[PDB]
Structure formats: structure tokens, C-alpha cells
Subunit: 68 residues, 4 copies
Amino acid sequence: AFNQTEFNKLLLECVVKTQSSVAKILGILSLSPHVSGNSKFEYANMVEDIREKVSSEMERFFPKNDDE
Amino acid sequence: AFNQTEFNKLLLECVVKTQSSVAKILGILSLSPHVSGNSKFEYANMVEDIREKVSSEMERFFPKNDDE
Amino acid sequence: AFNQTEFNKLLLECVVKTQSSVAKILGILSLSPHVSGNSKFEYANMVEDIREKVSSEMERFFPKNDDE
Amino acid sequence: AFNQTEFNKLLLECVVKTQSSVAKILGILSLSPHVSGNSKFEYANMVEDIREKVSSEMERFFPKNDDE
């Protein structure tokens, strides 16, 4: 017996918890001396790049414009 | 031929394994000297924040109250 | 227009790529001196714990026994 | 009331954001002195291995050949 609702709940918990955790992990590592002043890994630069990536994919599937 | 059941199994394995791994990664990094006494990255603070985030999203889709 | 097949493909790529990457990240961090001989974060211990977690969830949804 | 479209949007955002973040985390850690010249964790080697893994799973579900 496969419970799609319970599957959905587990799927959601894992991905939401992972993202919240990964956001903190990224923050911690952005502060490691071994990458200080390395532009690719400057927090603000990384956050912007991540933002673009999420936007680009979200726009393929759930565009802000609902009538292209 | 697309096997939804096998897709579901792979999806679940990846997300469950990732979350279990990320929980350990977070724990390890919380202990790095470069963030000791940095309040945003104190383990107990991070765990609480993650808890709130998971709860907030779980409540949108699978509320404890099944009759809002 | 929402393309479920393209959604499925993106979902799968992200989660598979993330898991493969997280497995490497875990390996790297397991080797950081700041957690050497800390039993919770010894690689073999972590891998076992992750294995149990994945098994426990996989068994809820896709049991090895297809007739419980 | 369960909104599959909103669920799909949250699922996608989490997994896309996580992957983008994990790619950066991997890059940062590949540069940590404690794994320099450790072949398993050399960035180019890791990227190749990840590529193979993603390809192998993508080929099971969405083969380049649509007529095997």
C-alpha cells in the first residue's frame, strides 16, 4: 500500500529541511578564511547567483506572467 | 517507458539520504572554530530556526488541524 | 503551460546531482581535523546512520516485502 | 485543501535552490587545504563523477534515445 499523501509529506519535509540547512551551511563556509576575498564565494555574489538560478527555473514552470 | 514507481523510489532515496547527510554536515560545521560564538550559527539556534521553517511550510500543505 | 515531464526531469536532475555532491561534501568534512576522533562524525559511523535512516523510510513506502 | 500546484512550486524552489547552493559548497570545500592533492576530492574529478551519476539516473527515466 503506497500512501501518496504521506509520501508528499515526507518529500516536503526533507526538501524544506535540507534547503534551510544548506542556507546555513553556505553562510558558514562563506566565512571560512580560505575563501575570503575569493569573488566566486563572496556571500552576496553567491546569493545573487542562486537567486538568478532559482528565478530562471521557476519562470519555466510557474511564470509570473500566466499568459505567455 | 517511464516508471513512476521507480521514479518515486529514486526521488525518495535521494532526498532522504541528502537530508540525513546535511544534518551531519551542519553539525560538523557548527563546530568549526571560525564560527564559535557566532550566534546565527550556534547549533541550537540553527536547529530552532530550521524547525520553524519546516513547520511553517508543513502547515501550509499538511496542517495539524485537518479542518481550517 | 506546465510540462510535468520536464518538471520531473528537472526534479530528478537536481536531487540526484545534490545527493552525489552531498556525499562528497560529507566525505571532505569527515576528514577535517576539528572533528577527528569525534565519534558522531566518524565517516563509517555516519554512513551507517545514514543507511539506517534511508532504509527506514524506504521500507515505509517501498518495502522489500511486497505483501505485508 | 491541498494545492498540488503550490506544492510543485515549493518543491521546485527548494530543490533548485539547494542544488545551486550545494554546487558552491562543493567548490568551497574542494579548496580546503586539508584535502589538497587528495584525488577523490579534486574538483575536476568530483565534477566528472557527479556528471556520470546524474547521466546514469537521467538515462533510466528520460533517455536521450526515446525508442529503446
